Symmetry: none
C-alpha cells in the first residue's frame, strides 16, 4: 500500500512513514486525510519536502472532496476530505 492515512498521531509518525515508503523505491505515494486532520496531511507533505527531500519530490495531484459520516451521536454529517499524490523526481 502506497497510502499514508493521516490520523491523530504526531505528524512525524506520518512523515517517517512516507519517507520510509519513498526510500523503499515506491515511486508514488498518496497522503490521505479528512476533517481536522486535513492540515496535518499538508504538514506531512511539506515536512517531507522541506526537511528531507528539498528537490527530489513533486506534488502529482491534490484532490479535495466530501463524504457523509455518522457522528458519535448518530447524526449524519458532511466531512471534508483531501488526497495528495506525491512522487520522487
Amino acid at each position: 500500500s502506497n497510502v499514508v492515512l493521516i490520523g491523530k498521531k504526531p505528524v512525524m509518525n506520518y512523515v517517517l512513514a512516507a519517507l520510509t515508503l519513498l526510500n523503499q523505491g515506491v515511486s508514488e505515494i498518496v497522503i490521505k486525510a479528512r476533517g481536522r486532520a486535513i492540515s496535518k496531511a499538508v504538514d506531512t507533505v511539506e515536512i517531507v519536502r522541506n526537511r528531507f527531500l528539498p528537490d527530489k519530490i513533486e506534488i502529482k495531484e491534490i484532490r479535495v472532496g466530501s463524504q457523509v459520516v455518522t457522528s458519535q451521536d448518530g447524526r449524519q454529517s458532511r466531512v471534508s476530505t483531501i488526497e495528495i499524490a506525491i512522487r520522487k523526481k
Copy 2:
C-alpha cells in the same frame, strides 16, 4: 462600483462567515475567487469550498487550482484554492 478583492482569507470565524463572503463575491459578478488559509484553518478552507460547490451552487463551480505551501514563522502550512463558475 469599486473592484473588491477576490480573495477570501479563512481565519478564526465560523465557516458560515467565509461561505457567505465567497457566495457574496460570486453573486456580485466575480467569476473567480481564491480561498486562502494557514495551519489548521486549511480544513475550514476545504469546508468552505465544498460548501460553496456541492451544496449551494451545484454544477456551476469549478476548482481551478489547489496550491499548498509553507510559510516561515518554525513553519506553517498554507493552502490556496482557486475556484470559478463553469
Copy 3:
C-alpha cells in the same frame, strides 16, 4: 500541478532577519521563494529581495513575478515577489 510555495513574510523587524530567512531557504535547496508584505513593509520587501540578489547571490537570483494587491481592513496594500535561482 502548481509547485508548492515557500513564503517569507516581512514585518517591522530589521531587514536582515528576513534576508536571513530568505537566504536560509535558498541554500537549503528550495529553488523559488516568495517575499510577501503589507502596508509600509512593502518597501522592506523590496529591500529584502535586492539585498538577497545583490549582496549574496549576484547573477544567481532572478525575479520570477511581482504581484500587488489590496486587503480590506479601510484598505492596506499588499505585495508578493517571487524570486528564483537562474
Copy 4:
C-alpha cells in the same frame, strides 16, 4: 523625466492619485508611477487607489520593476499601468 511619469515623494497619497488620474483623464493611455525607499509602499497605494476605486475594470497593471540605486543603497520601484 517622461511626461507620463508620476514621481512619489513625501506628500499624502491623494496628491499622487490626483496626478495619475489627471494624466489618465487628459488622454494619456499609459503612465508610470516611480518611487524609492519608504515611499515604495505609497507607490503601490497610489496604483491600488487608481485602478480599484477610481477606474474599476479599466486599468491594467502593465509592468512592475524593482531595483537598487546608490546614495548607502536604496530600493526603487516602477509601476507601469495602462487603460484596457
